[PDB]
Every structure is written in structure tokens, then in C-alpha cells.
Amino acid sequence: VNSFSGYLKLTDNVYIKNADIVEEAKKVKPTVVVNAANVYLKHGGGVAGALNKATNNAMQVESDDYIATNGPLKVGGSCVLSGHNLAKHCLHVVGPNVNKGEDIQLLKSAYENFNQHEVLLAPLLSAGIFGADPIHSLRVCVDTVRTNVYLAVFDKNLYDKLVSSFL
Numbered sequence: 001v002n003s004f005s006g007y008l009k010l011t012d013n014v015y016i017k018n019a020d021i022v023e024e025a026k027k028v029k030p031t032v033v034v035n036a037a038n039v040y041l042k043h044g045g046g047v048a049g050a051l052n053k054a055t056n057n058a059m060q061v062e063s064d065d066y067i068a069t070n071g072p073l074k075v076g077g078s079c080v081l082s083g084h085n086l087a088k089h090c091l092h093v094v095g096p097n098v099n100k101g102e103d104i105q106l107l108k109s110a111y112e113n114f115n116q117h118e119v120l121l122a123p124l125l126s127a128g129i130f131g132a133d134p135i136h137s138l139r140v141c142v143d144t145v146r147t148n149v150y151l152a153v154f155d156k157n158l159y160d161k162l163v164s165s166f167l
């Protein structure tokens with residue numbers, strides 16, 4: 001038993017809710033919140049900009065030190081950093097950005113990072129400003145992640161579409 005509430009169950013291990021991931025993180029304090037990161041951990045907009053704003057820019061400060069030490073992430077890769085006031089940990093995961101021409105097949109590699117964590121609160125990778133089809137992203141999530149994932153979908157119209165079209 002865990003503290004996530006109001007989710008619709010899609011599969012044995014995948015759950016979905018119309019929610020603002022920032023507010024969901026603030027209430028649940030999950031062990032892991034996933035950020036829709038880029039390779040530079042520049043949290044300017046989308047989910048990343050919202051998560052970072054909610055940390056009063058502490059996420060960005062920590063991220064800049066990470067990059068200065070380690071260099072950029074790989075597309076499809078991840079790193080674990082602090083969850084600040086939102087979660088114990090933040091798993092920064094880089095899905096391919098279609099608006100940069102990155103290979104959508106890397107989306108599966110991106111979701112594989114979730115399997116290193118037993119339970120996660122997450123957005124749909126490569127959705128939103130990353131330019132992928134959120135329905136495809138949901139399919140890859142379901143077919144790749146084996147651990148327990150609670151997906152927050154900010155847009156109510158999109159949430160309803162994802163549910164109604166789910167196979």
C-alpha cells in the first residue's frame with residue numbers, strides 16, 4: 001500500500017491521473033519524482049521549469065554543479081539528484097526531443113531508467129514541449145517499465161484522450 005490517490009489503473013504496474021506533477025509531488029512526497037530533463041539539466045520550461053520553480057531554483061543550482069563535474073547526460077540517460085521539497089529524490093530522465101530531431105527509438109531507453117526504482121511519480125517522457133505523441137509515449141511506458149509508475153498528466157483533455165484510446 002502507498003499514498004497515491006485518485007489514479008486509474010492501466011496495467012498491473014502503470015497508473016494514470018490528471019494532475020499537476022508539482023502539486024502531486026508536494027502532497028505525496030514520493031521517494032522518486034521524475035523530471036523531463038534535457039542533457040544540460042537546464043530546467044527552463046515544461047515539467048522541468050515547473051519542478052525547478054517549485055524548488056525556488058535549488059534544483060537548477062544543484063544541477064549546474066552536477067554538469068560542471070560530470071558533463072552532459074546522454075539522450076536516453078538519467079541521473080539521480082535531490083528531490084528538494086518535492087520528493088526524496090529526483091530522477092532526471094532525458095527523453096528524445098522531437099523538436100531537436102532526436103531519434104524517437106531512444107524513448108524506450110529513457111523509460112528503462114525507471115526500472116531502477118520500485119515506485120515513481122512521473123510525467124510522460126518526450127510529451128509536451130519535447131514534441132512526441134503522448135499516446136506513443138504511454139504505449140512505450142507500459143511496454144518498458146516494470147516497476148510501479150504513477151503518471152501525472154497536466155492537461156485534462158489529453159488525460160481523457162489517453163485513457164479512451166488505451167489498448
Ligand SMILES: O=C(O)CC[C@@H]1CCCN(c2ncnc3[nH]c4cc(F)ccc4c23)C1
Pocket residue numbers: 019020021022036045046047049050123124125126127128129130131132152153154
Ligand atoms: O515537453 C515534453 O515533451 C515532456 C514534458 C511534458 C510537457 C509539458 C506538460 N507536462 C507536465 N506533466 C505533468 N505535470 C506537469 N506540470 C506542469 C507544469 C508546467 F508549468 C508545465 C508542464 C507541466 C506538466 C510535461
